[PDB]
Amino acid sequence: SANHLPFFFGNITREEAEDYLVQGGMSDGLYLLRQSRNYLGGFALSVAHGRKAHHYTIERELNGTYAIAGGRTHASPADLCHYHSQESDGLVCLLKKPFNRPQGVQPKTGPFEDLKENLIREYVKQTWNLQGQALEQAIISQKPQLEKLIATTAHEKMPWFHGKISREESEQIVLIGSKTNGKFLIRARDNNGSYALCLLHEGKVLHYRIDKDKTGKLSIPEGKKFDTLWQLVEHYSYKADGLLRVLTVPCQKI
């Protein structure tokens, strides 16, 4: 329920947040809120101070409170922003002026966010045999648990996920058809938490390892850490960030 904040931009990138702060004058204490792109249920706070951008991850704690690492918990991202408008409490500066969404600009949603509500609805309907207002009351009654369940499993039916197939199989399926640069898929390996990203670069198939660390966080070695595979694909579809190129078209299943 951060959509109600006029300075919440949804799923924009660090770079887009920095472009918006520049457009807003880059004044000390100028700030906006965005959806975290690598922490599930998380937000990011982007603040101008000393003509630079400062970015803070606001995690959703186990108990449904919100905190920057090393900070007190708050009931909501709104409360955290209100609090940091009064007390710096370790932040680079006080939150002075929200940069609001310019007229007509909505919170950005990504591909997962567009499927989320329908996937939660269809799961509750099939699992619990509910319809109409009963169905909506169920969804609302367990929204946080349902959001978590659907986010951790949504990749299974996304077009770029090919399940447990071999290295050799993945090369064959990627090399069939038009050799579109950035054509990609993700496959499961042995360890139930390990994956590979398969990416077409100038007619060659690149294999990048995706490992689950002790937190449950997914990363390519030396790469940004994500709670989910769909976060990883959205990131590497926006910029290469260490890959030889950006992900483009999902490799169709057979």
Partner: peptide, 18 residues
């Protein structure tokens, strides 16, 4: 080198409160 490695280094550093 059966798996490709990331090139460069990450310039995505978040600030925190301590």
């Amino acid at each position: 080198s059966p798996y490709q490695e990331l090139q460069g280094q990450r310039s995505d550093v978040y600030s925190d409160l301590n």
